Amino acid sequence: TTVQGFDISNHQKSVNFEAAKKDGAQFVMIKATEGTTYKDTVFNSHYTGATKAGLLRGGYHFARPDKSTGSTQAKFFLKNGGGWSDDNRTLPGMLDIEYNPYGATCYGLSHSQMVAWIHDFVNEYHHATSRWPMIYTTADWWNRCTGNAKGFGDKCPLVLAAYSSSPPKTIPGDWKTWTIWQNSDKYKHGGDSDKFNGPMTQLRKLASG
Ligand SMILES: [Cl-]
Known part of the structure; x- marks a missing residue:
């Protein structure tokens, strides 16, 4: 079975x-930060x-x-909404690492640079x-920008975007499977639709660690 959830940002003014x-819906991921200085201004109201x-x-x-090291961005995220504690309420922070909206493929980084950057973020x-953070990406992006890199699958939950009636058939890296599948960018209650892989009891374990 799966558990329904969703993800949202300042693109949704009200939810x-x-x-x-x-x-x-039982869970939601909420945009907190971007790059080194951008704070999503609806994050507080959403959260x-x-x-x-x-x-x-x-x-x-x-x-x-392209704007800083992975550790810098982790630290910025952590101070601005990306924190986690075992309080029965909190999912581990999620790194959204995929297509550059600013028009340079893979942010100008090589495979080895990108793998190092992501390691730096997740380790910080x-x-x-x-907690290991969740990694949100597509199989296509992971292949292009990391060389389909292994090394994150046994630690970081994968949040895999693939818009379809059927679950994703291509699993990137050395992940066994996805933890969350982002199945549509058109969720009724706002933002993107997400499905957690398993029952609520396992979702609460993702929250608690
Ligand atoms: Cl890109």
Whole structure:
């Protein structure tokens, strides 16, 4: 089975979390930061709204690997919504690492540079929180920009975007399978639709570690 969730950002000015929860959504990932200085200005309102509605929630960071080291961006994310504790409410932070919206393929980095950047981000995140962050990407992007790199599969939960009625057939890297599948960019209650791989009990274990 799966558990329904979703992800949102300042592109959604207002979200009815109560309505999403009534409709089966149990968790939400919320954009907190991007690059080295951008704070998503709706994050606070979303995160509070999600908390009051009883959803599991966590933050996500939009990576811009050309702008700084992975550790710098991890630290910025951690100070601005990307934190985690075992409080029954919190998903580990998610690194959104994929297509550069600013028009340079793979952010101008080589495979080895990109793999190093992502290692730097995820290691900093783990150092600070004791949790490996989730990695959000597509199989296509992971192949192009990392050379389909192994080494993250046994530590970082994979959040895999592949818009389809059927679950993803191509699993990147050395991941066994996805932890969360982003199945559409058109969710009724706002943002993107997500599906956690398993029952609620396993989702609560993703939250607690
Ligand atoms: Cl790219």
